[PDB]
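The passage that follows is intended for readers who have already worked through the single-chain material. We present the inputs for a multi-component assembly, then the predicted structure in tokenized form, and finally a short commentary. You are encouraged to pause after the input and sketch how you expect the pieces to fit together before reading on.
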Amino acid sequence: APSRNGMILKPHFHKDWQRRVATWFNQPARKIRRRKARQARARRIAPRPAAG
Amino acid sequence: SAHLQWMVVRNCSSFLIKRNKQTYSTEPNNLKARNSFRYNGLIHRKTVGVEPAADGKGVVVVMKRRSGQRKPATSYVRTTINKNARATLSSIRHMIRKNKYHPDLRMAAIRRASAILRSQKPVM
Amino acid sequence: PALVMSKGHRIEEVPELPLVVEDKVEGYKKTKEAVLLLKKLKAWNDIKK
Amino acid sequence: GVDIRHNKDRKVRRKEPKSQDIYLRLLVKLYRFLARRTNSTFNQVVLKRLFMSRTNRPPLSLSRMIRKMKLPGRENKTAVVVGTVTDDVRVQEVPKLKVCALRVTSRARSRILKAGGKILTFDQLALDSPKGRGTVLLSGPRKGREVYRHFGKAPGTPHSHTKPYVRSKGRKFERARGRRASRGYKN
Amino acid sequence: MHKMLNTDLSRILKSPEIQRALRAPRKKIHRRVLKKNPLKNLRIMLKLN
Amino acid sequence: PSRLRKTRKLRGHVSHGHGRIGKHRKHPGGRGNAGGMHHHRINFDKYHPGYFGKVGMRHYHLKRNQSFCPTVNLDKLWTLVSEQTRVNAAKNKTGAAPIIDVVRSGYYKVLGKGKLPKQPVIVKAKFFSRRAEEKIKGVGGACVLVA
Amino acid sequence: ACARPLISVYSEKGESSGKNVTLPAVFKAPIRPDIVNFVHTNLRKNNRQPYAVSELAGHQTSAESWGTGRAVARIPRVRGGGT
RNA sequence: AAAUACCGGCACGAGACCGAUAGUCAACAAGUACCGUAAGGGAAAGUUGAAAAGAACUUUGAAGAGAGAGUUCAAGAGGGCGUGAAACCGUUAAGAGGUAAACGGGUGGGGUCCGCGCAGUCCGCCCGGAGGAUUCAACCCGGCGGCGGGUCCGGCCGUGCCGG
RNA sequence: ACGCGUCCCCCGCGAGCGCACGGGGUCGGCGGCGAUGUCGGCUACCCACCCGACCCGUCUUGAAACACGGACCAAGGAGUCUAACACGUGCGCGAGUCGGGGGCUACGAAAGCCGCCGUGGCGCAAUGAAGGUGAAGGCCGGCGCCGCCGGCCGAGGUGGGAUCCCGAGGCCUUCCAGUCCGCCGAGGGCGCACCACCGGCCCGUCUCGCCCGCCGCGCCGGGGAGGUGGAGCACGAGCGCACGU
RNA sequence: AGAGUGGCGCGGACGCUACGCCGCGACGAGUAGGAGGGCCGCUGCGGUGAGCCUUGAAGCCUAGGGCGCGGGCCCGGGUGGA
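Having made your guess, compare it with the prediction:
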């Protein structure tokens, strides 16, 4: 039962998108991992700056 | 300030009761345990509190001064009247009338003092 | 001050201050010194509750 | 059996505003007292504009405010604006005024405080004129939203001046059949 | 900004500037009257005629 | 909000607000745009006609970077530059016109819609309209082009 | 409001001190409980871990419905299963 | 090499997830028992007592199965032993039986038990009989608080004004 | 129908009282029986008798049906989420809002900050396939005359219209001229939102003739009047979140 | 309910949970479907009742009472032990 005047779209949900699911679980985990990697790099290069 | 915080207090509070179709407030300054704007002493500047003593000797009166704005303890002052009912109610009526301090609840304080002296009367 | 009594804290123990204590509070490193500070400020009934 | 149509038995207008704020409701309950005591229609119109919410009122513009103040017959006379007055940047000169409204934007407040205007609240205005003695009651232009281009006649119809719900207008979206005269027909 | 400055509606309403030009409060409760039959009852017919 | 829905109020119903005869079935009409030419023609061509067909030359490698060109009006010209220049423009008795750069604001073509106050300014842009040029030559001001 | 009283800052021993600092304007702020309750119900949801039911449970065991008759109520039942 | 993916495994932590027909099918000697010639299919299943203090002693009877004792706070926890729901059967007591049976309305009769009724609320003001309490109008001393010290003084405050 | 000082057509306060067919029931009248089986029992246990009384859900216009399923009971059990919209409601700032990605500082995978991290979305400007263009003008002089030197006013006009402003005057005390304040009002306008039309402007195009311009004097470029069509201008209003349909 | 210029005493109820109160009138059927309110109830999260009790928490029956126009609740008696 299609409704009255409105916008039209092409909802790409005909495929099995439940198979390929990749949602953002590790956003703050990736941020803390990049923070620790940057701190380890800054402690590795002692005279060199952060930019280089 | 006065009417502003009453709408917040009447919504949620620990002293208010909601059971058996009985919406009331159980504040200690609230006489007769009736929830109303006129029946309050914490918000208003003038506060009259009729309470019994620790022992069964008369009525203690908790008076509020002019300087009480943010003072929970040192604003209020306590006194104790240990006399008969006639001169006690006469002294309370003189405090209400001649001192001109909160001349609003006159008969309710009389009935409250009568109920307190009837309660602290020794049992048969 | 009415919302504190609506919450249920013992407001009677503080005579008059929206409590601001001196900068030597961070210098204490003992729980007995903390209990002594709470007894000097008389605010013990709220934690006894 | 009495044939009474009970369809329009209850008035569909609001008996109370649906907003949840403590500063508005006390003023509403005070203007209830003023509207029931004063016999004038001024407090009733102010109360009805307190019933009409943010979606039921348009934002008033400063350029049209100055344009309505340039009309004669209102010299040394204040204007009570219920809705919000938004700042319009296409203005250069501004005299001193006495602006009283609910919410005024910060650029307009800076311009009024630079010009030398006294901004006051509604309580002193109610103390000055309870019945509305020496006030001009104004309202903003309601025809100032995007949805009015969608209201009215249905599209896909000859002589229909109404914006259709198109996801993205362009060179190929709804141009070939219904618009051209060669490809079929046109309306 | 604050919506209203003086937040004391009782002090606003007890001011003489509002209470100068106002109508008097019609404080009189009017219950319904029992319409007695003037054909049966005697002195009701004497009242209205 | 499960308690703030109609599915708690409609507890105790057969079809849950979907009629006695015509129940809420799977697909009465179709799936999406099924049968758009046969029986949904009345539905689609009455509301949104025009999609069926080709039009124009098909431009394949289209880029919006060369086609991006925002315009600016003469009415909001004083809004970009600060108020001290508006003081100094009235202060200048000789008529030293201040420089107002349009490329700094990020616009290319200058149009004319509203009222401009009668004092000269220098406008540096890429394009200029003819009527806006007539208003600039009537009021006062130059038109410095840029590549 | 605009008027702000003077605050006598007490000492740590209990008695009052001589320092007096003017009260800030945050203590005369307008109160709005609705936005506070809305942000409270948002931030109390913004620290919640999701949970899931095992999706593969149910589709591993195979079954086939015989249809009408055979003293069943049109339910896909277990094929075989000598137990 | 660098930021990218991880549903299996090696070590953990946490949860607004579920709670013995639920949760992994499997919380226990679970792909285990079992079925099919085979690729294959696939179960049922927790709660004694804190502590076994697990019942010695007498009798009936071939033994099974009873009747008295003992333990413990209680067997009201008796070897398939947390508590003890309905559908179903029987027993003790009460009622009815020539228009299966039952229900809705009006009451009538008998009992189940409840009223702690079986000599039955009183309260304010005035007067009288004999009473008791050193107890009141009125006046000094000390302490506390409020109306407005109208027009006594000085600080403080103002999204006030005018300045240096 | 009932003292007179005050206008004829014509011969401004009395004191008390009794009782009431006078704005919805009272008695200032009464009697009995009760401490070992009587008093009250509507709710609930059983029985008797009077009236009514086709077995619950589905189908169809029409079902209690010789239309369908139902031996009984405990437990379980059947419009859920994301994405995209149309409308309604609440908050914030406002021509802006939004950090949803990035960086800096047990509960806390909480939280705070960035503004030269606003890179970027939306919208205040439309019309065309595109080459492109683009959203008022009016008044007075120099010149029966085209172009330009000057000054002034400025986002249109008419009608219906919320409410305000002014007021022909009025609003009672042994006497009369007589002051400011307060209320109402004959009548006249500025006219709020909104509605109806006439407009003016822009863009693609048809018809009509003419005027201008030059480092590059032409198959050059610009302009005027009347129509046609436009999801247009007529003085911003949207953005981000939460809920329901 | 106006204002000015001149010729013995020490007393008087309810009220106003202003999201409360009552006054005066009209009407009471209605499936599908839509709108509003539940001091109706189950299980969980953040606070709160100086909350509860081995001298009985929760759950199960009942010829006992009353509260309801309702979704339901309270104690009288038996089981029961956190």
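Commentary: Residues 1 of chain E lie near RNA strand H (CB under 10 Å from a C1'). Helices of chain E lie at 9-13, 16-19, 43-48. How closely did your sketch match?
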